Design a protein around this nucleic acid. Structure first.
Ligand code: MG
Ligand code: MG
Ligand code: ZN
Ligand code: ZN
Ligand code: ZN
Ligand code: ZN
Lengths: 162, 162
DNA sequence: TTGACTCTCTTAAGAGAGTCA
DNA sequence: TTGACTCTCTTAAGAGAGTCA
């Protein structure tokens, strides 16, 4: 809600509830031929999810609290960042999964950044493969690699140069 | 329907027309602190665009030819790839700008790949900065870099470990 | 046959809000 | 007040199809 105290209280309640989610170990590529271990705090697959949580989409959830008799609701991964600016360079800030695991609500696996920065982590080589993200990646992005291009640049005639 | 010879004739007429688009020289980052040059063949900003071309969206165009009284229409960047497979790994193939310049229709600046591969080139370090795309990038992706993350992973209590 | 407009849709990373019990 | 559902929207890389003269 409006007060910093009320916001800190929302963050504290969220952390307490998510801290009781099942902790699932995931071994992950780091880049550079190395592997690491992440501990994700995963929201349940079906109701009940936890106090204050409800599912609004196949992999979308919301957290809600009643403050001053009014319901306040947020995207379930945005709560850690309620005291941060909600935009940057005129772009909306988004909750970004460093573990690339949507059900995870571990705030040690989340950052707050533009949707472009968020998306781009999918292709990052990872913290041991050359990640240059100032807020460093926790793993190599799941889509990093050579790709599967069907056809490359080509011309039939002689009208074009690179 | 259309024979492979009719398709080649469409590609040839498309190349003839695109080859007469204004050619703009762009200096671009290659990665590794190096600079290179790309020559983009840019569709005009407003009508007329060129024989067979029409705008269906702010940065979307289509190419149209009528053959034996039947109207055929294609996305304006898909024409170079009409003799190629149109899917791979269960994913639709898309025209992917190696020059990251949507108005460009230079077929030497295009490849044909999944939408995920396509998007990922936005963050590639480039052909002189560590690109691992099998069909190599022509330049560093426009969104490559440290990013502008507003807040990193953090917790208020001690409920979480990474 | 052609040009110049019109409309809505896909994907996968993210969102806000209403209806009931 | 709290839970469990419902719906559509945003973005930026990409698409298909209709109308009129
Ligand atoms: Mg993400
Ligand atoms: Mg692209
Ligand atoms: Zn996680
Ligand atoms: Zn990274
Ligand atoms: Zn180009
Ligand atoms: Zn590349």
């Amino acid at each position: 809600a409006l007060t910093n105290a009320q916001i800190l209280a929302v963050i504290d309640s969220w952390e307490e509830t998510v801290g009781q989610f099942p902790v699932i170990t995931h071994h992950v590529p780091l880049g550079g031929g190395l592997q690491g271990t992440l501990h994700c705090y995963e929201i349940p697959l079906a109701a009940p999810y936890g106090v204050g949580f409800a599912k609004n989409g196949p992999t979308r959830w919301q957290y809600k609290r009643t403050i001053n008799q009014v319901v306040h609701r947020w995207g379930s991964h945005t709560v850690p960042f309620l005291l941060e600016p909600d935009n940057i360079n005129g772009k909306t800030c988004t909750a970004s999964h460093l573990c690339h695991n949507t059900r995870c609500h571990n705030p040690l696996h989340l950052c707050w950044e533009s949707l472009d920065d968020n998306k781009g982590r999918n292709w990052c080589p990872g913290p041991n493969g050359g990640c240059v993200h100032a807020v460093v990646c926790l793993r190599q992005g799941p889509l990093y690699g050579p790709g599967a291009t069907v056809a490359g640049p080509q011309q039939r005639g002689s009208h074009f140069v690179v």
